[PDB]
Amino acid sequence: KKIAVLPGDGIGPEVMEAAIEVLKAVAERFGHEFEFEYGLIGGAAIDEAGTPLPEETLDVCRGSDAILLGAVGGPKWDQNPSELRPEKGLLGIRKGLDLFANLRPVKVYDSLADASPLKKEVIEGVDLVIVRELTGGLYFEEGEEAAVDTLLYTREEIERIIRKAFELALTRKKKVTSVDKANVLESSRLWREVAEEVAKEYPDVELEHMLVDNAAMQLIRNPRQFDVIVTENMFGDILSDEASMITGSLGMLPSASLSTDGLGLYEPVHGSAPDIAGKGIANPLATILSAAMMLRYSFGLEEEAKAIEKAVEKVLAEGYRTADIAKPGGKYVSTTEMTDEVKAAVVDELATSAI
Amino acid sequence: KKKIAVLPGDGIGPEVMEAAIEVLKAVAERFGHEFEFEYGLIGGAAIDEAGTPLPEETLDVCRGSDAILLGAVGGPKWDQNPSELRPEKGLLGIRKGLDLFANLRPVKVYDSLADASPLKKEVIEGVDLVIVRELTGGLYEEGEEAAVDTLLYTREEIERIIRKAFELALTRKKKVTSVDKANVLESSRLWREVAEEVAKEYPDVELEHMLVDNAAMQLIRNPRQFDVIVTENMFGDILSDEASMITGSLGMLPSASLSTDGLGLYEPVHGSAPDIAGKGIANPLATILSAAMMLRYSFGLEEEAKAIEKAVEKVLAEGYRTADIAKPGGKYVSTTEMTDEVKAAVVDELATSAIMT
Q1: Which among B140, B275, B279, B327 is annotated as catalytic?
Q2: Which of the listed residues A65, B90, B99, B283 has the most CB atoms within 10 Å of its CB?
């Protein structure tokens, strides 16, 4: 099984090395090994060569069973962008790879039910996933006296995504919140109809319709009501970023993006935090937890996945924190500390231990 | 002698309306002036009592007035049998009707209630912010194979909305957060351009640009940062609704909407709440606080506004709470026991001596 690793820049290279370290450990214990191929992306791909996303690399992803991405973006490329070169990169990966589904899981750790800006009374039990359409809806001269944007969805597109939403619900709490603005948007009338059409092929799953703005109130008022939420390209952008606050440190969260044909790209939701890069103290868990995702959805290796979720779970229950999830004043570990500890947790949950 | 269009509607609309009305009726007496109140049918009560969800007759009356107060619309009766041609949403029929462009949803948390919200007290205690929302532009056959929505913005629409935003920031904390998607949206590339260009006209107001996805985060991680938020139709709808939670309950929240010429419609953000209609448990403060902004914006009467606002602030500081702002097991009051208590706080705040003076 061949894997596409792309650290990028900032702490990208750091949290990537961290992820791969945890990864390697689990596979050597489990029988199989992996071939790793390395590629530039964004700032590193703008420097050492031409485009934010080189052809030279795009194909290495294409010839590989999964992709691990770190981060991109920086000050260096904030002034002197050209608005065609600064970071993403990512779009280009998305469109270049026919990735249609975005999967952002949010399960709050008991360990951590006090990190959020929200009250522990509300965040304690939440474990939900936002499933986001990536191909349709919006997107894909100073002085103009007017501007236009076209929101275009196809019935294929919607159907393709809502199905993933039900597939996932089946492995979870068998409930799908479908979020549309169907009291105003042509595309949303379509969405909700596509929705009820599929509801029928999974009679054992609850489908509810939620208006996009309600959704936003309920994500802070009562995220425990949610299992799976499926939504259109823009909304998903907004709701992901909102739901992300439920847990508090973007440093926890992982994301997967999946292709029409089942190719995967896995990455941490957190940006590049370029200040902190080089001082070995970025929280490696998200990228780590991401490789767990990869394990699950790219290769069906469920146990090798649970192995990490189970590990990470404990290390935090021990009360290990990195900078970001540390209480104020609380003691915190470095990246390799965190890393090495997560390793330790897996070996100990893979034992003999008679006597 | 200044005319007011009054639009109760359904659910608890009339309930809360009648509340807000009394408070208003009082202040005027204490203050000399008096108000004429023409009553109108709207929503379900217009579908029932005369055919159309928004009779032209009423529309005409809103036109011949100086300000509009609306309660709420919606209910099971027309949740089924909608037609999507009359589901008690002539609320839009009013937006376009009198060319409302500016929606204002203020959010300032009473310390009484820093623990009434889903968000931690630490985070929500300072906040006092307005989301200003563009109402005219932007967004807006089973079996079909595809769908399209056009998002249309004209430079005028935007100039106008970014203006009332700065105009407001001046009377507040001189900050404006312009919220767009300038990295993917065409309408937003234009949006920014207009705000940069208007900001030059106000060098004593801070301009910041913020992407919407961020904004959604920032509203819950650090809502204190915000003074004025100005944004587009859809974004503004989502962000409004997200930030509503920061106070906690909707029963606490007023909204105004303005026209080009400056006609005003003040309504509570909270919905029909059909389940508790007639049962005098509804929180009338929002609707009241709305009639307050009405005094401010539609009639320049700043003291009469401050009169209501602080009167309300008191009744909270005291310990009064209705069903929705009560922590559980704590005691709450009825609509009228809420209304009356507020009426009292206007008279004693119109006390004018300190064993002295």
Answers
A1: B140
A2: B283
The technique is X-ray
CB contact under 8 A, B185 and A149: yes
Rounded CA-CA distance B307/B220 in Å is: 31
Indicate the residue of B120, B216, B244 with minimum beta-carbon distance to A119. B120
The resolution in angstroms reads 2.8
Phi/psi at B25 (nearest 5 deg)? -45, -40
A170, two tokens: 């089946």
What is the per-residue DSSP string for B244-305?
HHHHS-GGG-EEEEEESS--EEEEESS---GGGTTTT-S--HHHHHHHHHHHHHHH--HHHH
Active site residues of A: 139, 181, 213, 237, 241
Chain B environment of A245 (Cβ under 8 Å): 217, 220-221
DSSP 3-state assignment of B48? helix
Amino acid identity at A136: G
Pair of tokens at residue A349: 């949950």
Cα(B306)–Cα(B98) distance, integer angstroms: 28
Give the range of the structural domain holding residue B137, as residue numbers without chain letter.
1-357
What are the residues facing B257 on neighbouring strands?
B103, B265
How far is Cα A25 from Cα A340, in angstroms, rounded to an integer? 11
Between chain A and chain B, how many beta carbons pairs sit less than 8 Å apart? 129
- Quick one: CA torsion of A154, A157, A158, A159, rounded to 10 degrees? 110
- Return d(Cα A60, Cα A37) in angstroms, integer: 7
Phi–psi pair at A324, nearest 5 degrees: -65, -40
- Residues B237, B314, B324, B343: which is the catalytic one? B237
Reading phi first (left if > 0) and then psi (alpha if -120 to 50, else beta), residue B84 is in: left
Measure B190 CA to nearest chain A CA, in Å. Answer: 7
User: In Å, how far is A342's CA from the nearest CA of chain B?
Assistant: 29
- Sequence-distant (6+) residues with CB within 8 A of A262 are A298
Looking up residue A276, the CATH number of its domain turns out to be 3.40.718.10
> How many domains does chain B divide into?
1
Q: Are A264 and A294 in contact (CB under 8 A)?
A: yes
Amino acid letter at A348?
Answer: D
Residue ranges with strand state E in chain B: 2-9, 35-39, 67-72, 100-108, 128-134, 146-154, 175-180, 206-211, 228-231, 254-259, 264-268
Query: In the structure encoding, which two tokens stand for residue A193, read together?
Result: 């109809």
Could you give the C-alpha distances from B356 to A188, A221, A273, in angstroms and in order?
Answer: 66, 49, 61
Closest residue in B to A150 (Cα–Cα): B150
CA angle B51, B56, B59 (to 5 degrees): 125
What are the backbone dihedrals phi and psi of residue B19, each rounded to the nearest 5 degrees, phi first? -45, -80
Q: How far apart are CA A136 and CA A245, in angstroms?
A: 26
What's the rounded Cα separation, in Å, for the pair B64 and B35? 14
B261 a catalytic residue? no
Task: For CA atoms A14, A15, A20, A22, give the dihedral sign.
Answer: positive
Cα(A275)–Cα(A254) distance, integer angstroms = 21
Return the closest-CA partner of residue B190 out of A307, A147, A105.
A147
In this structure, the number of other CB atoms found within 10 A of the CB of residue B200 comes to: 8
Cα gap A125→A29, rounded to integer Å: 32
Structure tokens, A323: 């900078």
